[PDB]
Design a protein around this ligand. Structure first.
Ligand SMILES: Cc1cn([C@H]2C[C@H](O)[C@@H](COP(=O)(O)OP(=O)(O)OP(=O)(O)O)O2)c(=O)[nH]c1=O
Ligand SMILES: [Ca+2]
Ligand SMILES: [Ca+2]
Ligand SMILES: [Ca+2]
Ligand SMILES: [Ca+2]
Length: 901
DNA sequence: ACAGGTAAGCAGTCCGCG
DNA sequence: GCGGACTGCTTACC
């Protein structure tokens, strides 16, 4: 089979590669890569290498990478450009693998692990590595086994071996409840002492050397600690065994009152799962502990136990080890669902970069663009330095705060990416410029046509319509990929709504779920069978459908992230092809396009409907417009409408039959105006919102820019079984507003849109009345803790000290001394609560690490001095007042005027 | 260093106000 | 004895 790399590193004048050969065996080699750079030369001297702009270049082979590095320096010490790929690692791959890489993941060794360290002291700082490692669970994807390393003897207590039979029993039977599906894949290994533990671990690591190393927070804790622990004991010569090439690099970076350590192991690709989740999950969590995340993604338990984790191993060792095995497993479950590793490999092998580089859009695209240029024998430009500069972006229409019964939305596809393709924007397709007229002239189709021969943009740039352009081309490949995966996703969504509509006929029968591929729209034969299935079989299918959707989502939203990131890279000084002229061409064209079609859409509707000068487009943001469909329902009036689904199907057809075509002709015209390479401004219908038939609900409302809510019935072709709320920017969508309030505010909104003002007040009085009995954790607000020290001023708030920071300082003060209470980590999330006058803490609020309960020491005080009144006003009432106010409505009734009656 | 701009809402301060 | 006019900090929408 076609070969493919595993990892690659540059060490001195050599390149170290681990790869899979034609036979599927993992090999390693050390190459004295002879790099090759370029320099401009006289037009006469002819060759095959030309820079992206069409200039001749002479190629220079170098004895070794070191000589090529010194040549780039000498070249700058002179003032001449030094073209070519300066990152010799990438050049090496590009050379070694000149073909679309087809890899086999079953050959890639993905390791997953977690360790435990008892510490009565406090949190075992990896830099110090003072306490012993008493447990290690390491899962190997090739062997598909959990290798468990237990330390039975330690200065913190000796314990009896772990029992796998006990781990398997249910909690309720005094067991640990370790999943059945992995009990057989566990290899338990007890040890008399730490040295033998650590020593046996390293030999294991030698035999099963990880290619991809993942885990939860593994990069900032596990790895560092196991490195420094092995260092402080056997010496840095042994510790370096963790690297297959015996080479490590330790970067420091210490805070104002803390020491953090960054270890890099050459020959291994570390993908901390928390970093993968932060970048690809598209979520913003109140806490990032595995428990919180595990519950959010899998709906599993809280992994409970009694006492501090510091005393867990000593009092219930059986559970301690079982909990360590389960934690490692939970990450596997989350990944089996989100599939971030697969995504990483896909992106990695597509661009020919180190796998750990998928975190860098700039690196990713540099390699993609590079490889694409190599094929046409072109030479890439040299990276230059630039000063940062602000530049304009998208346009956002100021909405009129109010309610909106029926609303319909429209939106363009991969906007910026499409704009790049339509105008043919790229570092080498620049033709020139043109005197520009105020932006509103082009919108109003009044300004003179910029060019008759070139592709143009309202910002004054012109691009060749004839040529190709590596960016436009390379950006189209990834875009087509997204197209596909988005297809499978939306299908899984639709198939999913069917199963829900079917959960209304739960047939009293014993079954087994159908065997279908949820990536495709269910066929009639299937749609036929499902109607007869049981609530049991239907649910498993719903579950499988949703897991298919999530998998699709991951695949699609992240390819979208990538292409949108190429646009951003154009606006970043570190990008080899940085250029504000191109970035601005994109955003400016966007501002024009959005408003251009606003003018248009407002015409065709004022025309058709009949009225004149009536604003149908009530809002818009970057590439979307929300059109009011009241008059479109008025010209027919609530009449020939049997049930809600009636007019929803009505509007669906109106947009799909009339509105859209109009829009297509509106953008086709603009493409002509700007004389662009090709028309790709495709704007289709999005959401259809409004209240249920004959309801007291307002259907929707806006309060300001980026702040609105709508009761949607159909979204991009999916007809929900139950109306789904679409809220944007309101408190309900923010991680900082307490969970109880998000849930409560969302119910108020739901009642406010689906039902009338009566249901809202009814629920408002109810909530206000019960608010006091909610758990403290669910009514606490959340916030990140940045620059704590900065406003320290010796344990007290400083100048302009932030509420959450303040609340932290009061915390460290209430636990000051007894080093055992969890310390708030600089840069993490924290729960925050307001304290009434007279509290023993000496302040109006207190803060503590999120995803946790406050230390049992101060917990009862804070519970007693909680200012429920401020919490209700600030987090609930104030924002509620915002929604109802803008929507012309009241939550707490009003002066009946008929009072005394 | 390591995709980008737009915009809202909360507090903290400072300053005008019989 | 605050109101609002800025400013710093968060976090969401594109
Ligand atoms: C979400 C997002 C958008 N944008 C820009 C580029 C986008 O094309 C534009 C509009 O964003 P979106 O409408 O969110 O997305 P999209 O147009 O790219 O694609 P689609 O709706 O088909 O999924 O805003 C970014 O630069 N970065 C981002 O992270
Ligand atoms: Ca743990
Ligand atoms: Ca879009
Ligand atoms: Ca769409
Ligand atoms: Ca959009």
């Amino acid at each position: 089979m076609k070969e493919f790399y595993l990892t690659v590193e540059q060490i001195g004048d050599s390149i170290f590669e681990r790869y899979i050969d034609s036979n599927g065996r993992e090999r390693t080699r050390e190459v004295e890569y002879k790099p090759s750079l370029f320099a401009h030369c006289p037009e006469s001297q002819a060759t095959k290498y030309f820079d992206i702009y069409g200039k001749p270049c002479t190629r220079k082979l170098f004895a070794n990478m070191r000589d090529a590095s010194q040549w780039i320096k000498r070249m700058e010490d002179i003032g001449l450009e030094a073209l070519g790929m300066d990152d010799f690692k990438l050049a090496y791959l590009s050379d070694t693998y000149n073909y679309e890489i087809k890899y086999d993941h079953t050959k890639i060794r993905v390791a997953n692990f977690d360790i435990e360290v008892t510490s009565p002291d406090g949190f075992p700082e990896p830099s110090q590595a003072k306490h012993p490692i008493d447990a290690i669970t390491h899962y190997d994807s090739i062997d598909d086994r959990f290798y468990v390393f237990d330390l039975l003897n330690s200065p913190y207590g000796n314990v009896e071996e772990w029992s796998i039979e006990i781990a398997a029993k249910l909690q309720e039977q005094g067991g640990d409840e370790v999943p059945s599906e992995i009990i057989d894949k566990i290899i338990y290994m007890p040890f008399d002492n730490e040295k033998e533990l650590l020593m046996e671990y390293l030999n294991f690591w030698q035999q099963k050397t990880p290619v991809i190393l993942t885990g939860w927070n593994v990069e900032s804790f596990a790895i560092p600690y196991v490195y420094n622990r092995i260092k402080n004991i056997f010496g840095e010569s042994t510790a370096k065994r963790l690297s297959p090439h015996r080479k490590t690099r330790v970067k420091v970076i210490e805070n104002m009152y803390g020491s953090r350590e960054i270890i890099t192991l050459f020959g291994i690709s570390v993908l901390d799962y928390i970093d993968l989740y932060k970048k690809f999950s598209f979520t913003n969590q109140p806490s990032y502990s595995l428990d919180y995340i595990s519950e959010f993604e899998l709906n599993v338990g809280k992994l409970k136990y009694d006492g501090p984790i510091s005393k867990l191993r000593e009092s219930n060792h059986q559970r301690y080890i079982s909990y360590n095995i389960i934690a490692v497993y939970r990450v596997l479950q989350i990944d089996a669902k989100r599939q971030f590793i697969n995504l990483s490999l896909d992106m990695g092998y597509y661009a020919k970069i180190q796998i750990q580089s998928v975190f860098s859009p700039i690196k990713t695209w540099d390699a993609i663009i590079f490889n694409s240029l190599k094929e046409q024998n072109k030479v890439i430009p040299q990276g230059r330095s630039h000063p940062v500069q602000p530049y304009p972006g998208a346009f956002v229409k100021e909405p009129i705060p109010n309610r909106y019964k029926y609303v319909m939305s429209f939106d363009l596809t991969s906007l910026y990416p499409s704009i790049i393709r339509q105008v043919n924007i790229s570092p080498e397709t620049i033709a020139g410029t043109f005197k520009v007229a105020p932006l509103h002239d082009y919108i109003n189709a009044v300004a003179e046509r910029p060019s008759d021969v070139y592709s143009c943009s309202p910002n004054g740039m012109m691009y060749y319509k004839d040529r190709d352009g590596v960016v436009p081309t390379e950006i189209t490949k990834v875009f087509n990929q997204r197209k596909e995966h988005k297809g499978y996703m939306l299908a899984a969504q639709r198939n999913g709504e069917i199963i829900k509509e079917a959960l209304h006929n739960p047939n009293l029968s014993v079954d087994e779920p159908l065997d279908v591929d949820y990536r495709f729209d269910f066929s009639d034969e299937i749609k036929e069978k499902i109607k007869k299935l049981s609530a049991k079989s239907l649910n498993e299918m719903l579950f499988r459908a949703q897991r298919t959707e999530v998998a699709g989502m991951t695949a699609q939203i992240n390819r979208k992230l990538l292409i949108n990131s190429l646009y951003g890279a154009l606006g970043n000084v570190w990008f080899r092809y940085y250029d504000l002229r191109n970035a601005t061409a994109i955003t400016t064209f966007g501002q024009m396009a959005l408003q251009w079609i606003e003018r248009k859409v407002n015409e065709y509707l004022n025309e058709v409907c009949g009225t004149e000068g009536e604003a149908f487009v009530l809002y818009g943001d970057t590439d979307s417009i929300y059109v009011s469909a009241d008059k479109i329902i008025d010209k027919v009036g609530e009449s020939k409408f049997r049930d809600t689904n009636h007019w929803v199907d009505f509007l669906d057809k109106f947009a799909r039959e009339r509105m859209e075509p109009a829009i297509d002709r509106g953008f086709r015209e603009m493409c002509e105006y700007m004389n662009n390479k090709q028309h790709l401004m495709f704007m289709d219908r999005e959401a259809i919102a409004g209240p249920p038939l004959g309801s007291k609900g307002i259907g929707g409302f806006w309060t300001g820019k980026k702040r609105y809510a709508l009761n949607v019935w159909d979204m991009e072709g999916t007809r929900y079984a139950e109306p789904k709320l679409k809220i944007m920017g309101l408190e309900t969508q923010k991680s900082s507003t307490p969970k109880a309030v998000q849930k409560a505010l969302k119910e108020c909104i739901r009642r406010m849109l689906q039902e009338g003002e009566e249901s809202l007040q009814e629920y408002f009085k109810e909530f206000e009345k019960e608010f006091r009995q909610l758990n403290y954790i669910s009514i606490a607000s959340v916030s990140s803790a940045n620059n704590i020290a900065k406003y320290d001023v010796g344990g007290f708030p400083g100048p302009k000290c932030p509420f959450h920071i303040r609340g932290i300082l009061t915390y460290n003060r209430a636990i000051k001394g007894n080093i055992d209470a969890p310390q708030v980590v600089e840069g993490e999330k924290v729960y925050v609560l307001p304290l009434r006058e007279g509290n023993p803490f000496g302040d109006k609020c207190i803060a503590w690490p999120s995803g946790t309960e406050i230390t049992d020491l101060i917990k009862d005080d804070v519970l007693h001095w909680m200012d429920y009144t401020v919490l209700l006003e600030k987090t609930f009432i104030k924002p509620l007042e915002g929604f109802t106010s803008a929507a012309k409505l009241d939550y707490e009734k009003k002066a009946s005027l008929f009072d005394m009656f």
